[PDB]
C-alpha cells in the first residue's frame, strides 16, 4: 500500500539519519571562514556533521537566513540545511547575486521535487503512479519538468484545467506547510533498499552511483516524500511564492510506456512577478 | 627553609594533604562556599576560580586518583611554594543561569593531569592552592557544546578588507 | 529609586533535568536617565515589541526619532551581553519579549512668560527597558475567524440557564 | 478656552495609542549587496555613501592643494590617479590629482 | 489651491529662492557633486540643466555669458562652464545631472539628496543597479523573448 511504502521509506531514512549522526559522537569543532564579500573574516567554530550553513546564517544575522538560498563550501554548492563535515570556506548565495545560476538550478530542482510529490499523492488509489525522473532542463526552457508513468488504465486520460488547478492547489498546500528540504548523502545500497519498489528510481540511483567515485547518492525529503536529487535544493518550500502546474505532455515514444511530463513554473518570494508577467510565463510554460 | 620556619613539615606527607585541599576547594566551588575557598585557596587563586563561574552552577566531583600524588618542585614576608603533580580522574557539568548544560557530562569521568602550586605565608598562614601550571603540551580541553562566532575586522567605511 | 531590572539578570535557575524542554534564555537590559520623554520613547518601545532582534534593529536604524538611536544602542548591548554572558548561541535568535519606557528623575526649571508670570519646565528624563528571549519571535495572534467567532456565540447560547428559579 | 474637566487616563490612552499615532513598520528596508549594511530601496546605502564621501573629501583636499587659493578653478578636465598609475593617452591634457593610496576596488 | 504651480516656495521670497538656488548651483558647478535638502536639489536640477544648455550655446553668445555671469557667483567657474562642462556634454542632449536620495540629515532628519554632473572625476556614487539578467525571473523573460523572436 502507498501509505505503508511511505512509512517504511521514512523509517529507513530516519534510521540512516541516526546512523550517520551516531558515526560522529561528541562535538568535533570545525572552523568555517566566511569568504563572502560582506562580513569578511568572520570564522565560525561549528559542530561537525551537526551545524549547517543555516546555523552560520543564524550566527551572522536574520537577513542571511532569509536571503541565502545556497551555500558554497570550498567552492561547491551546498544545501542550507546540509550538515558541514570539515573546516572550510563558506559563501552564501542568494537569488539576486551577479550569477545566480546555481541558486536557479537548486530552485528548479526543488520545484520539480514538489511537483513529483503532488503528482504521487494526487491520483486515486486504484491508479498506480510511478515517478521516473526529473529531467535537468534549463531555466530558459521556461518550465520545470517532472516525468511520471501513470496506470495503464488512464492511458487515454489527459488532465483537465480543473485537474491542473487541483495540482496547483496541492502544491500551494505544500508551500503553506513550509517544509524544510532535508538532505542526506547516503550509500547506493541504502538508496536501493529505500527504492526497491521502483525500477526507475533504482536505475537512476545506479547511474548516480556510477557517476560519483563512491556509491554516494543525494537523497532528499520534503515531508514523507523521499526522492533522488540531481543536485542541491533550496531551504524550504515557503521560498516558493508563485507555483503553477502548467500542463502535461505525453512523450512520443509511447510503445514502451506512457512517459507523461508534468511541466510547471514557479517564482520565489524574492523574485515575485506581476500578474500579467506571470500569465505570460504560464502561457510559455504550457508548451 | 620550610622546616626551619615550621619545624613539623613533611615533604613525604604533603601530597595527601595537597590532594585533600584540592578536593575540598573544588567541592567549595561546587557549593559556592566562598568563605571556605578563602581558606583553601590563595587570593591569587580565588578570582581565577570564581570569576568565570559566577552566576552558573558547576557540578564537580572527584572519582579517583590514577597515580598517587607526589611533590615535584619546591621553592621559597616569606612564602613557600610547592608544586604537586596530580594525575587523577574527575567529572564536570557546568550549566547556564537557566540550568542548561554547557560543558562536560554529569557522569562520564575524565582523566586530568595537572600541576597544582600551593603556597604558604610564614604566623597563622596555611597551605593553599596558588596556581595551576598548564603544560604547553597539554591535550586540548573538552570541546564546548555551543557553536561560536568570531567577528572579523569591523571595518570603517574608509577601510578596506585585506 | 528602583533598580530591579538590572538584578533580574542575576537569577540562577536550578539545572534542568534531561527530560525537560530547554529553557529559553532571558536577558534583561536597560538604559537609565535618557534625555527623552517617556511618552515619546513608548512609541518606539511599542513598535519593537514582539519583533526579532534583527528586525527591531533594522526598523530603528531608519527611524528619525532621537530615541531610535538610543534604543538601537541598548539592543546591541543586550545582544552582546546575551552572547557573551547568557550563553545565547546565535545573535539573531533573539526577540524583544518586553520593551517599555519609564519615567526618570526629572529636573524643574522656570519658563518666563509675558507679564512677570512663569511656568515650571520639567527637564524630562526617561528609562528604557528590554527583555530579550532566545528563540524565534512568537507568531502574531491570528485574527479570529468567522468559524471561531460563531463557535463562541453558540457557546454563549448554550451557557444560558433558567435564571431565578429552581 | 480652557478644559472643562480633566481628561481621564482611559481617554488619553485611547487617543495616544491609536494606530494612527503608532509608528508604522517600514517594509522598504533591504540589505546592501556591496557591504551588507541595511538600506532603504530608494535611498543610497549609508555605509557606501560614506565611503564615497570620504574618498571625495580626500580628493578634494588634494584638489585644493593643487589649486592653491580661491578662484583658481581649472579650465581643463581633472583625472584622479592613484599610486602605481600612469596617465593614459586619453588622460593626457587633464590635470592629475595624485592620491597616496592604492586604487579602490569600487572606484574604476 | 496650487494647481499647476511648479516652483517651490523657498527661502525668504522669490529673490531669496533664486539666490539659494544660485548658491547651490555655483557649488554644483565648482565641485560637480553637492549634497543638500531633497527639495532644493530637485528645484535646482532644472537650473543646472539650463546652465549646461547655455554653456553649450557658446562663449561668444552675449545672452549665455550674461546668464552665466548671473548664476555663477564665483566668476572663475564661468570659464569652467563654457570650456569643461559644455564640451563634456556636447554629445548629450539632456540629462546632465544625476540626483539620488541620501540618508536623512543627522541634525534635523531632513530629506537629503546628492546631485552630480555626469562624467565628473569624482568617485562613482553607489548607484542603484537593476537585477542581473541571469536571475530566475530575468532568465524566464529572456526565454519568452527568444520564443517570440523565433516565432517571428
Ligand atoms: Mg508640566
Ligand atoms: Mg519656509
Ligand atoms: Zn553598502
UniProtKB/Swiss-Prot annotation, chain A:
Isoform 1 is ubiquitously expressed. Isoform 2 is heart-specific. One of its GO terms (biological process) is mitochondrial translation. Keywords: Acetylation, Leigh syndrome, Mitochondrion, Primary mitochondrial disease, Ribonucleoprotein, Ribosomal protein. It is found in: Mitochondrion. One of its GO terms (cellular component) is mitochondrial inner membrane. Coiled coil: none annotated. The modification N6-acetyllysine is found at residue 91. Residues 28-94 form the TGS domain. GO terms for molecular function: nucleotide binding; RNA binding. Its main location: mitochondrion. Component of the mitochondrial large ribosomal subunit (mt-LSU). Mature mammalian 55S mitochondrial ribosomes consist of a small (28S) and a large (39S) subunit. The 28S small subunit contains a 12S ribosomal RNA (12S mt-rRNA) and 30 different proteins. The 39S large subunit contains a 16S rRNA (16S mt-rRNA), a copy of mitochondrial valine transfer RNA (mt-tRNA(Val)), which plays an integral structural role, and 52 different proteins. It is linked to Combined oxidative phosphorylation deficiency 59: An autosomal recessive mitochondrial disease presenting with multisystem manifestations of variable severity. The disease spectrum ranges from lethal infantile Leigh syndrome to a milder disorder characterized by hypertrophic cardiomyopathy, lactic acidosis, attention deficit-hyperactivity disorder, and survival into adulthood. Belongs to the mitochondrion-specific ribosomal protein mL39 family. This is Large ribosomal subunit protein mL39. It comes from Homo sapiens (Human). The gene is MRPL39.
From Swiss-Prot, chain B:
Its main location: mitochondrion. It comes from Homo sapiens. It is found in: Mitochondrion. GO terms for biological process: mitochondrial translation. The keyword Transit peptide applies. Belongs to the mitochondrion-specific ribosomal protein mL45 family. Component of the mitochondrial large ribosomal subunit (mt-LSU). Within the mitochondrial ribosomes, required to direct the nascent polypeptide toward the tunnel exit and position the exit at a distance from the membrane surface. GO terms for cellular component: mitochondrial inner membrane; mitochondrial large ribosomal subunit; mitochondrion. This is Large ribosomal subunit protein mL45. Component of the mitochondrial large ribosomal subunit (mt-LSU). Mature mammalian 55S mitochondrial ribosomes consist of a small (28S) and a large (39S) subunit. The 28S small subunit contains a 12S ribosomal RNA (12S mt-rRNA) and 30 different proteins. The 39S large subunit contains a 16S rRNA (16S mt-rRNA), a copy of mitochondrial valine transfer RNA (mt-tRNA(Val)), which plays an integral structural role, and 52 different proteins. One of its GO terms (molecular function) is RNA binding. Keywords: Mitochondrion, Ribonucleoprotein, Ribosomal protein, Transit peptide. The gene is MRPL45.
Swiss-Prot record, chain C:
GO terms for molecular function: RNA binding; structural constituent of ribosome. GO terms for cellular component: mitochondrial inner membrane; mitochondrial large ribosomal subunit; mitochondrion. The keyword Transmembrane helix does not apply. One of its GO terms (biological process) is mitochondrial translation. It is found in: Mitochondrion. Its main location: mitochondrion. Keywords: Mitochondrion, Ribonucleoprotein, Ribosomal protein, Transit peptide. Component of the mitochondrial large ribosomal subunit (mt-LSU). Mature mammalian 55S mitochondrial ribosomes consist of a small (28S) and a large (39S) subunit. The 28S small subunit contains a 12S ribosomal RNA (12S mt-rRNA) and 30 different proteins. The 39S large subunit contains a 16S rRNA (16S mt-rRNA), a copy of mitochondrial valine transfer RNA (mt-tRNA(Val)), which plays an integral structural role, and 52 different proteins. Belongs to the universal ribosomal protein uL22 family. This is Large ribosomal subunit protein uL22m. It comes from Homo sapiens (Human). The lineage of its organism: Eukaryota, Metazoa, Chordata, Craniata, Vertebrata. The gene is MRPL22. The chain holds residues 41 to 206 of 206 of the full protein.
UniProtKB/Swiss-Prot annotation, chain D:
MRPL32 precursor is processed by the m-AAA protease (composed of AFG3L2 and SPG7), which cleaves the N-terminal transit peptide. Cleavage by the m-AAA protease takes place prior to assembly into the large subunit, an essential step for mitochondrial ribosome (mitoribosome) assembly. Proper processing by the m-AAA protease is dependent on the zinc-binding region within the tightly folded C-terminal domain of MRPL32: zinc-dependent folding halts degradation initiated from the N-terminus and triggers the release of mature MRPL32. The chain holds residues 79 to 186 of 188 of the full protein. Keywords: Mitochondrion, Ribonucleoprotein, Ribosomal protein, Transit peptide. Zn(2+) binds at residues 32, 35, 45, 48. Component of the mitochondrial large ribosomal subunit (mt-LSU). The mitochondrial ribosome (mitoribosome) is a large ribonucleoprotein complex responsible for the synthesis of proteins inside mitochondria. This is Large ribosomal subunit protein bL32m. GO terms for molecular function: RNA binding; structural constituent of ribosome. Belongs to the bacterial ribosomal protein bL32 family. It comes from Homo sapiens. Residues 86-108 are annotated as: Disordered. The keyword Transit peptide applies. Residues 91-103 have a biased composition (Basic and acidic residues). GO terms for biological process: mitochondrial translation; translation. One of its GO terms (cellular component) is mitochondrial matrix. It is found in: Mitochondrion. The keyword tRNA processing does not apply.
Amino acid at each position: 500500500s502507498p501509505t505503508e511504502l511511505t512509512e517504511m521509506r521514512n523509517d529507513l531514512f530516519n534510521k540512516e539519519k541516526a546512523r550517520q549522526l551516531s558515526l560522529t559522537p561528541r562535538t568535533e569543532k570545525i572552523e568555517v571562514k566566511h569568504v563572502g564579500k560582506t562580513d569578511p573574516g568572520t570564522v565560525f567554530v561549528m559542530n561537525k556533521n551537526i551545524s549547517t550553513p543555516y546555523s552560520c546564517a543564524m550566527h551572522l544575522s536574520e537577513w542571511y537566513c532569509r536571503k541565502s538560498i545556497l551555500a558554497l563550501v570550498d567552492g561547491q554548492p551546498w544545501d542550507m540545511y546540509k550538515p558541514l563535515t570539515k573546516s572550510c570556506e563558506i559563501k552564501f548565495l542568494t537569488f539576486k547575486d551577479c550569477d545566480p545560476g546555481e541558486v536557479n538550478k537548486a530552485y528548479w530542482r526543488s520545484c520539480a521535487m514538489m511537483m513529483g510529490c503532488v503528482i504521487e499523492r494526487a491520483f486515486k488509489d486504484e491508479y498506480m503512479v510511478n515517478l521516473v525522473r526529473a529531467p535537468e532542463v534549463p531555466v530558459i526552457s521556461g518550465a520545470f519538468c517532472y516525468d511520471v508513468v501513470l496506470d495503464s488504465k488512464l492511458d487515454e486520460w489527459m488532465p483537465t484545467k480543473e485537474n491542473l488547478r487541483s495540482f496547483t492547489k496541492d502544491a500551494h498546500a505544500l508551500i503553506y506547510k513550509d517544509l524544510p528540504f532535508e538532505t542526506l548523502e547516503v550509500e547506493a545500497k541504502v538508496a536501493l533498499e529505500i527504492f526497491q519498489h521502483s525500477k526507475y528510481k533504482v536505475d537512476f540511483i545506479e547511474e548516480k552511483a556510477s557517476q560519483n567515485p563512491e556509491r554516494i547518492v543525494k537523497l532528499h525529503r520534503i515531508g514523507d516524500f523521499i526522492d533522488v536529487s540531481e543536485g542541491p535544493l533550496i531551504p524550504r518550500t515557503s521560498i516558493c511564492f508563485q507555483y503553477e502546474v502548467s500542463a502535461v505532455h505525453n512523450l512520443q515514444p509511447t510503445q514502451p510506456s506512457l512517459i507523461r511530463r508534468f511541466q510547471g513554473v514557479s517564482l520565489p518570494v524574492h523574485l515575485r512577478a506581476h500578474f500579467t508577467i506571470w500569465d505570460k510565463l504560464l502561457e510559455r510554460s504550457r508548451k | 627553609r620550610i622546616k626551619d620556619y615550621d619545624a613539623n613539615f613533611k615533604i613525604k606527607d604533603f601530597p595527601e594533604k595537597a590532594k585533600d585541599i584540592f578536593i575540598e576547594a573544588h567541592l567549595c566551588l561546587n557549593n559556592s562556599d566562598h568563605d571556605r575557598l578563602h581558606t583553601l585557596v590563595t587570593e591569587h587563586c580565588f578570582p581565577d576560580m570564581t570569576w568565570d563561574i559566577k552566576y552558573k552552577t558547576v557540578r564537580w566531583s572527584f572519582v579517583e586518583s590514577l597515580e598517587p600524588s607526589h611533590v615535584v618542585q619546591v621553592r621559597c614576608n616569606v612564602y613557600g611554594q610547592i608544586t604537586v603533580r596530580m594525575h587523577t580522574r574527575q567529572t564536570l557539568a557546568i550549566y547556564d543561569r537557566f540550568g542548561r548544560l554547557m560543558y562536560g557530562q554529569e557522569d562520564v569521568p575524565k582523566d586530568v593531569l595537572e600541576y597544582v602550586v600551593f603556597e604558604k605565608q610564614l604566623p597563622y598562614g596555611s597551605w593553599r592552592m596558588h596556581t595551576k601550571i598548564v603544560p604547553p603540551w597539554a591535550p586540548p580541553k573538552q570541546p564546548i557544546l555551543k557553536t561560536v562566532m568570531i567577528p572579523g575586522p569591523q571595518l570603517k567605511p574608509e577601510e578596506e578588507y585585506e | 529609586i528602583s533598580r530591579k531590572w538590572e538584578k533580574k539578570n542575576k537569577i540562577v535557575y536550578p539545572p534542568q533535568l534531561p527530560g525537560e524542554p530547554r529553557r529559553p534564555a532571558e536577558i534583561y537590559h536597560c538604559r537609565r536617565q535618557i534625555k527623552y520623554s517617556k511618552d515619546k520613547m513608548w512609541y518606539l518601545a511599542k513598535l519593537i515589541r514582539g519583533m526579532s532582534i534583527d528586525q527591531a534593529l533594522a526598523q530603528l536604524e531608519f527611524n528619525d526619532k532621537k530615541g531610535a538611536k538610543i534604543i538601537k544602542e541598548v539592543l546591541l548591548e543586550a545582544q552582546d551581553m546575551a552572547v557573551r554572558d547568557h550563553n545565547v548561541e546565535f545573535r539573531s535568535n533573539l526577540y524583544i519579549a518586553e520593551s517599555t519606557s519609564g519615567r526618570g528623575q526629572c529636573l524643574k526649571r522656570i519658563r518666563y512668560h509675558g507679564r512677570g508670570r512663569f511656568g515650571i519646565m520639567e527637564k524630562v528624563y526617561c528609562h528604557y527597558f528590554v527583555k530579550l528571549v532566545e528563540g524565534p519571535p512568537p507568531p502574531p495572534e491570528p485574527p479570529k475567524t468567522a468559524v471561531a467567532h460563531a463557535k463562541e456565540y453558540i457557546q454563549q447560547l448554550r451557557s444560558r440557564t433558567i435564571v431565578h428559579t429552581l | 478656552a480652557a478644559p472643562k474637566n480633566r481628561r481621564t487616563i482611559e481617554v488619553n490612552r485611547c487617543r495616544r495609542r491609536n494606530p494612527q499615532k503608532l509608528i508604522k513598520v517600514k517594509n522598504n528596508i533591504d540589505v546592501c549587496p556591496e557591504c551588507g549594511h541595511l538600506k532603504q530601496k530608494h535611498v543610497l546605502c549609508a555605509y557606501c555613501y560614506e565611503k564615497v564621501c570620504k574618498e571625495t573629501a580626500e580628493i578634494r583636499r588634494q584638489i585644493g592643494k593643487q589649486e592653491g587659493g580661491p578662484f583658481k578653478a581649472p579650465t581643463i578636465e581633472t583625472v584622479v590617479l592613484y599610486t602605481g598609475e600612469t596617465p593614459s593617452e586619453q588622460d593626457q591634457g587633464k590635470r592629475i590629482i595624485e592620491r597616496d593610496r592604492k586604487r579602490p576596488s569600487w572606484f574604476t | 489651491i496650487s494647481h499647476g504651480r511648479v516652483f517651490r516656495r523657498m527661502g525668504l521670497g522669490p529673490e531669496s529662492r533664486i539666490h539659494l538656488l544660485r548658491n547651490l548651483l555655483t557649488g554644483l558647478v565648482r565641485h560637480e557633486r553637492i549634497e543638500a535638502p531633497w527639495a532644493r536639489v530637485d528645484e535646482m536640477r532644472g537650473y543646472a540643466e539650463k546652465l549646461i544648455d547655455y554653456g553649450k550655446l557658446g562663449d561668444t553668445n552675449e545672452r549665455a555669458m550674461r546668464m552665466a555671469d548671473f548664476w555663477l557667483t564665483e566668476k572663475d567657474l564661468i570659464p569652467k562652464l563654457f570650456q569643461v562642462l559644455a564640451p563634456r556634454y556636447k554629445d548629450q542632449t539632456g540629462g546632465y545631472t544625476r540626483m539620488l536620495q541620501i540618508p536623512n540629515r543627522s541634525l534635523d532628519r531632513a530629506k537629503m539628496a546628492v546631485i552630480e554632473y555626469k562624467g565628473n572625476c569624482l568617485p562613482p556614487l553607489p548607484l542603484p543597479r537593476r537585477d542581473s539578467h541571469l536571475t530566475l525571473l530575468n532568465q524566464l523573460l529572456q526565454g519568452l523573448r527568444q520564443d517570440l523572436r523565433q516565432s517571428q
